[PDB]
Amino acid sequence: IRDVPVLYHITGAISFVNEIPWVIEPVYISQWGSMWIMMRREKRDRRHFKRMRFP
């Protein structure tokens, strides 16, 4: 879950996310490294992996 600031119109006509995604670069790269490790360790466990159905 990510709770983001929102700046909307008073009629609901349009709703912006009033945020910029700042990251600490070492932490972001390390988090995606752990991600790489995990998504590789899982695919080798599920030999029949069911992709999401689009749309």
Binding site: R41, D45, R46, R47, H48, F49, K50
Partner: protein
Amino acid sequence: LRKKEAKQRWDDRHWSQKKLDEMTDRDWRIFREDYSITTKGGKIPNPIRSWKDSSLPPHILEVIDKCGYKEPTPIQRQAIPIGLQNRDIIGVAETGSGKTAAFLIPLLVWITTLPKIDRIEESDQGPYAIILAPTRELAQQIEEETIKFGKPLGIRTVAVIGGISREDQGFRLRMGEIVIATPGRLIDVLENRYLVLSRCTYVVLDEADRMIDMGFEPDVQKILEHMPVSNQKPDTDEAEDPEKMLANFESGKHKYRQTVMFTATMPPAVERLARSYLRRPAVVYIGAGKPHERVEQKVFLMSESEKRKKLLAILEQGFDPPIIIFVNQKKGCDVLAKSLEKMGYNACTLREFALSNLKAGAKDILVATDVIDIQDVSMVVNYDMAKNIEDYIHRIGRTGRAGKSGVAITFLTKEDSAVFYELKQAILESPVSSPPELANHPDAQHKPG
């Protein structure tokens, strides 16, 4: 580091080398997703991994072993735990996947597990289960399967459908536990008081979409009106409770009635029928004479001299034994078998001894020409292209009439241009198949001759 590697290896194992008490939720998910089964509903019981690993009664296991079913189908393996809990089940699957066995197994277990005092009935109160079929041929096939399954267990099966003489059907009904019939014939019998569902505790709806397309929906609604309403499960959360459902199933003859619906589609009429007959049912989704339409076909175009390298590369990627290799001549088949044996592969040439070895796992690759009976194979390799479409279709049919689609790999050369059009037509007619090389080939644009 080796001890750490071994521990790591040991945590996330495949279920092929794990025990059941250590089978975690994620391992179970990998299992069900492998068998192409998807379950809708809460508190879904763990699927049956194998007959030995299943919790079936010893008599039922012996009967199944005598029946020759080495491994339960994914539909059966996923529906048996649900059926054993006396909960309604919605089966998404086509004919030929073993749905009849998956529906009969819980009924046979419950019927055969009843006490002798409880199973004694002085008067005939009709069958304890009703199986509905939309077609006479399907009803006859289901009756044959039920006779094969329940005959050793002392269960009487009566088939009441069209295409049979009235006197024979009437005489059989007077004898008095399982009834399989069509909607119209069953409705006519019920309206005439020729059979009753006083002791009915299981309703089987096979091919509900087919029955709806046949216009039997009003007939099905009328038939359900004759069932006792007092045996219907409550329409609350308790209908899908695992402990409560298991306790109700263990109640024997006093257990609430269960309904199982198997169909390939869920139209609005099917939804209404499910809402009427079923209460908090669980949805189980899985996934005859045209193997090309239901068999995955792969085509690789190259020279004749490159066939061996491609076959070696494909084999190096791994496969599920047994496998079938197709050759045009016996000498070529023998040469290919010798080459495979030189590459450290257990290759069989092609009587019953080779098939027994392949079934037992000793032999992994079977090489034979277009010229018996063999089990379903995970992959069929067409090293030499068949000279006719019928031969290729028959070879592609070795992957199985139903169940896993399998893989059909055929090597196409310039000498097989006479069957390019037929191969392209077969491939384009297979929804389980993805080939621009053959479809756009100049030799596949017009019929030969």
